[PDB]
């Protein structure tokens, strides 16, 4: 787990202050979550986690969308600039 709170910031839909998109822990999966997230294919979405108000260090994240659609972001926090991202329905 190792933080009390994790919340997810980035371009739109999402936002670079605030913490409109809380993860919540997973304890079965060991990692936090974010609720679902519409993203347009095509794009470049830039983003990152603030962990107990610690930004993530370095350049934004980035993932290229693959398709319209819902997405669970995810953060480890023993793998801090992992890129997962997860279609969901």
Not at 29 to 39: A, F, I, M, Y
């Amino acid at each position: 787990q190792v933080y009390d709170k994790v919340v997810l910031r980035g371009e739109s839909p999402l936002r670079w202050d605030g913490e409109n998109h809380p993860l919540t822990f997973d304890e079965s999966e060991g990692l936090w979550k974010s609720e679902p997230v519409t993203l347009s294919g095509g794009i470049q979405f830039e983003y990152k986690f603030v962990m107990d108000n610690e930004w993530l260090a370095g350049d934004n994240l980035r993932f290229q969308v693959p398709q319209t659609g819902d997405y669970v972001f995810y953060f480890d926090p023993s793998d801090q600039r992992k890129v997962d991202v997860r279609p969901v329905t």
